[PDB]
Amino acid sequence: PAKLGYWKIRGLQQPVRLLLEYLGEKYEEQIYERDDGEKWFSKKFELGLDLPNLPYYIDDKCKLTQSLAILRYIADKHGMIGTTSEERARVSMIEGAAVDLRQGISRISYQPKFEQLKEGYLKDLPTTMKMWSDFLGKNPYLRGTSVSHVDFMVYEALDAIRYLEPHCLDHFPNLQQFMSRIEALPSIKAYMESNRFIKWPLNGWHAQFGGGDAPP
């Protein structure tokens, strides 16, 4: 079983957990609690990682850092990366846009001026959602009929944003169905009902938004 290391939050690791649960990969999570900073910063350079960071992934074949590299390793091993250069590039494009979507809310949430930034962010949100709604179109998933790691990235990003603006998906029925479709996948549904599931926080505990001890 691979060892995964990360804070006890959703943040960057959630899409990886979801993917691991979807393809039935056995893994052990090394959870770092709110007060484990010292614990991490003391072993950070003792784990044998080339470029130390959280999250990290370790198994008999690989030692990795970088949330996207970790997600793509599991996806690669399961044939979800793309078979041609054009396809692999299109996949990377979707990942990049998904990173932008999640990082956008992350940026303003860790900002002391969150309250101020929030208004501008909410003003632009609609255009962003439309772009994604138009991209998904009539497809069940981002790349067609089959689920892949990008779906779990976008799903998590949308779920986090709906915590800030609950009606953000109201005018986009396909995005709403997309969310339900993911939550209805047998392996996902079961994981979300387990005690392994981390529902909160969305961001780091110290965030102006999404960092409480409980949902707002």
Ligand X SMILES: N[C@@H](CCC(=O)N[C@@H](CS)C(=O)NCC(=O)O)C(=O)O
Measure CA of the first residue to CA of the last residue in the chain; give whole Å: 35
CA distance 98 to 72: 14
CB contact at 8 A, 3 and 59? yes
List of residues contacting ligand X (CB under 6 A): 11-12, 44, 53-55, 66-68, 96, 100
- Residue 110 among known ligand-binding residues: yes
| Min separation Cβ 48 and a second copy, Å | 12
44 is in an annotated binding site: yes
d(CA 11, CA 6): 9
Residue 85 makes CB contacts below 8 A (sequence gap 6+) with: none
d(CA 110, CA 118): 11
Place of tokens 């494009």: 93
Q: Which is nearer to a second copy, 54 or 192 (CB)?
A: 54
Q: How far is the CB of 173 from ligand X (least distance, A)?
A: 25
Does 61 contact a second copy by CB under 8 A?
yes
The token pair at 18 is 């979801």
Q: Taking the complex as a whole, how short is the minimal distance between the CB of residue 8 and ligand X, in angstroms?
A: 12
Applying CB under 8 A, which of residues 34, 43, 77, 171 lies at the interface with a second copy? 77
Interface with a second copy by CB under 8 A: which residues? Answer: 50-53, 61-62, 64-70, 72-73, 76-77, 81, 85-86, 88-90, 92-97, 131-132, 135
Residue positions in the annotated binding site for substrate? 110
